[PDB]
Amino acid sequence: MSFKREGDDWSQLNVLKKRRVGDLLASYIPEDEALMLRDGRFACAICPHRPVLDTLAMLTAHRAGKKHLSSLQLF
Amino acid sequence: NRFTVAELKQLVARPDVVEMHDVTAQDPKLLVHLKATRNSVPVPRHWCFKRKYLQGKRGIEKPPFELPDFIKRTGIQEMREALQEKEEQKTMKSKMREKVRPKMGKIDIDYQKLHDAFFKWQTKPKLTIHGDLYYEGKEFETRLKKKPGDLSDELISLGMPVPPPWLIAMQRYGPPPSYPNLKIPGLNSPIGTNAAEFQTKTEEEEIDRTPWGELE
Amino acid sequence: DATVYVGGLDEKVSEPLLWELFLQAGPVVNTHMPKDRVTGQHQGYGFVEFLSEEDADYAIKIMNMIKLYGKPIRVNKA
Ligand SMILES: [Zn+2]
Which sites are covalently linked via Glycyl lysine isopeptide (Lys-Gly) (interchain with G-Cter in SUMO2) (chain B)? Predict the structure, then answer.
């Protein structure tokens, strides 16, 4: 398996996929807007009640939503 | 049909425990009797709060867990930190290639050091006595409140030989109204006669302090 | 009177020290001594909530006793 690679570890590949999705989506979120918690979750720092969201995919989908946009323009 | 708080408070043997809603109880006499019994711990305070327990904005910024000291003495944290700092640089090719040609003896701490961490350097942590229930703000409101007649070393800022500078004026302005029973030297406390401190000396001479039944 | 306003302080002075300073007179139940975030330093004025009136009445007198870093401190009702 050294000379030509054999097989693939689909669980670790899925871990890598989660990292690459995270890096991609994170580069479009400015550093003030998102606060990363101790366990790897994310809070929205715009919205006054700080909702906490499990992934960066959910944080991006939140930042699309109308509650966030209304809370955004006040800040 | 039901008591108001004043009748209930007089009917208790001890009226400091009664709250607004205890009158709404189906048996309020027994409830305030049980709240004033010794060594019982009160109902957790968030039973009436609308927000869920520990789901609060201050809890967002909690820092990571810290290891105890006797474990950081092993050097586990520096080794494993370096290790996972290399492993984010590797590609999937390289990781799957060292899974067919492994690398022995990498992250090894000698057994004697690990045994000593657990069987020699272990220290008991700070523990809490019974009835000290955790609530949500607790670890920030843990500063408490130090009484007049007891000074801190730092309050060094005064730099005065040992009585208090303010007292030279408390005798002038009077004893403060807020404290009815406070006692300070020169006003109503001996610097009459001063035999109070001699009592503590004589008693302290009297005592044997040898704990019975300890290890030799 | 439960609260007092305290002026004219030096930032080395601290809220915990301040609590011990005024509890020398009588216990400060609620302490407030602003931390300014922008330049990370204190302007030196304070607000103190006590148990009841007792702490407040003493308050003004407590000011005379106080002397931080060779300087006085304003205490008045609020
Ligand atoms: Zn938001």
Answer: 35, 86
- Same domain? For B64 and B28 the reply is no
Q: Which domain holds residue B118?
A: 59-127
- B95: chain A residues, CB-CB within 8 Å: 12
- Chain B partners of C18 at a C-beta cutoff of 8 Å? none
HEC sequence for chain B: CCCCHHHHHHHCCCCCCCCHHHHHCCCHHHHHHHHCCCCCCCCCHHHHCCCCCCCCHHHHHCCCCCCCHHHHCCCHHHHHHHHHHHCCCCCHHHHHHCCCCCCCCCCCCCHHHHHHHHHCCCCCCCCCCCCCCCCCCCCCCCCCCCCCCCCCCCCCCCCCCCCCCCHHHHHHHCCCCCCCCCCCECCCECCCCCCHHHHHHHHHHHCCCCCCCCCC
Resolution in A: 4.7
Same domain, B123 and B89: yes
Residues 42-71 of C with CB under 8 A from B: 50-51, 53-55, 57-58, 61-62, 64-69
